[PDB]
Amino acid sequence: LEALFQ
Amino acid sequence: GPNTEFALSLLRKNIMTITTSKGEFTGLGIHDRVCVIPTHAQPGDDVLVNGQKIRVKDKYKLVDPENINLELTVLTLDRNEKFRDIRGFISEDLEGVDATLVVHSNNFTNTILEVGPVTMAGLINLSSTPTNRMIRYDYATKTGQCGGVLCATGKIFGIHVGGNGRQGFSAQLKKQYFVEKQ
Hints:
Chain B: Residues 1-178 form the Peptidase C3 domain. The structure holds two protein chains of two kinds. Chain A has no helices and one strand. Chain A is mainly β. Chain A is rod-shaped, with a radius of gyration of 5 Å. Chain B has two domains: 1-14 and 84-182, Thrombin, subunit H, CATH 2.40.10.10; 15-83, Thrombin, subunit H (Beta Barrel), CATH 2.40.10. Chain B has a six-stranded antiparallel β-barrel with strand order 1-2-3-6-5-4. A six-stranded antiparallel β-barrel of chain B has the order 7-8-9-12-11-10. In chain B, a hairpin with a 2-residue loop joins strand 8 (109-126) and strand 9. The radius of gyration of chain B is 15 Å and the shape is globular. Strand 1 (2-5) of chain A pairs antiparallel with strand 11 of chain B, so a sheet runs across the interface.
């Protein structure tokens, strides 16, 4: 996954 | 109940708004004078803790033992008002497939969001940056919630670091990484 900073 | 009790308790006792370059973030004080804040938050030389401008004493970007980003910026300040040792609740073995997210960041300051089922994704990319020990919870989350404390009564899992689609992603704060530090 390339989850993004939130 | 006791879960929400812990959340609202932790929030008021060791959680404080740390305003830095990327904005307001959930400052999770581990103990005494050390607190953890996301790396993407961009903590600098001086941060605003609850509006109080305090200079950094030691800023250590905690990376994973596999020499990969862990994303926890160990922000050590010469803290006058020492934090309570909540490190006992920080777990290496979570066993808390039921977690609650306490957001105290830029988009939601003081917002208890129960995420429900929490699992782990292992190793993935976080903002195109490989990051280790990523937590995955099936709960639609967005920007602004990052920095929030993922916890349950008796277990601190870590902090919300980001998300991918409808799955939120947090950093797994394993007791091992903090119990050793002094």
